Each structure stands twice: as structure tokens, then as C-alpha cells.
Amino acid sequence: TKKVLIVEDNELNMKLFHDLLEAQGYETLQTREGLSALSIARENKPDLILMDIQLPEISGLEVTKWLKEDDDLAHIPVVAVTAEERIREGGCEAYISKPISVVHFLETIKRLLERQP
Numbered sequence: 001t002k003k004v005l006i007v008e009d010n011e012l013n014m015k016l017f018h019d020l021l022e023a024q025g026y027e028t029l030q031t032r033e034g035l036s037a038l039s040i041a042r043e044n045k046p047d048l049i050l051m052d053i054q055l056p057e058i059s060g061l062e063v064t065k066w067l068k069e070d071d072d073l074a075h076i077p078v079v080a081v082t083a084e085e086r087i088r089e090g091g092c093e094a095y096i097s098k099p100i101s102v103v104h105f106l107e108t109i110k111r112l113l114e115r116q117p
């Protein structure tokens with residue numbers, strides 16, 4: 001089963017993302033903090049990271065830089081959740097804007113998670 005690490009401080013958004021991903025048969029890991037996301041990634045090896053760029057304590061883009069600096073985490077695709085240029089340059093594979101489109105969101109994540117090994 002593929003696992004998606006969701007980094008989102010907002011309860012409503014976290015629940016929406018979790019519900020949508022669970023419906024697809026994916027397992028999820030959850031946290032509201034950028035630093036914790038790094039720790040969790042090293043302890044549970046997620047297959048994709050859904051990163052809110054607008055976290056209250058830190059920029060998700062700075063967290064993404066730390067991910068790319070780690071030899072074990074650099075390969076994990078990161079999808080930014082923003083409220084394209086900056087995100088792509090930051091190391092994110094794609095971006096999802098809010099209000100999010102359910103189909104666009106799922107298509108984007110499946111495209112990155114479901115490809116021949």
C-alpha cells in the first residue's frame with residue numbers, strides 16, 4: 001500500500017486530503033508541522049509528500065529544501081498545496097491550489113504515485 005505524508009496545519013484541509021486519499025486505498029501519515037514532517041519521513045518512508053506551503057511556523061518551500069538535501073528523502077515526490085514558478089523551482093513536482101479541484105488533486109497524486117517502477 002502506498003503512503004502519503006500530509007503536512008497541513010488546518011483541520012478541515014487535513015481531513016479532506018485524508019478522506020480523499022483513503023478512498024483511493026492509500027494509507028496516510030499526518031502532521032501539522034514542517035519539522036515533524038522531516039522526522040516522520042525518516043521513520044516511515046512515505047511514497048509522496050503533500051506539503052502546505054503556507055504553514056504558520058515555516059515556509060513549506062524551506063522544508064522541501066531540507067528534503068532534497070537528504071539522500072534518503074530526495075527521491076520522494078513533493079506536491080505543494082498553495083493558497084507554479086516558485087513551487088517548481090523549490091523542488092516540488094506539482095502544485096495544488098485551494099479551493100482544490102478533487103479530480104485535479106487525485107489525478108496529480110495518482111500520476112506521481114502510480115507509475116511503472
Ligand SMILES: [Mn+2]
Pocket residue numbers: 008009010013052054055
Ligand atoms: Mn494550512
Ligand SMILES: [Mn+2]
Pocket residue numbers: 022
Ligand atoms: Mn484512516
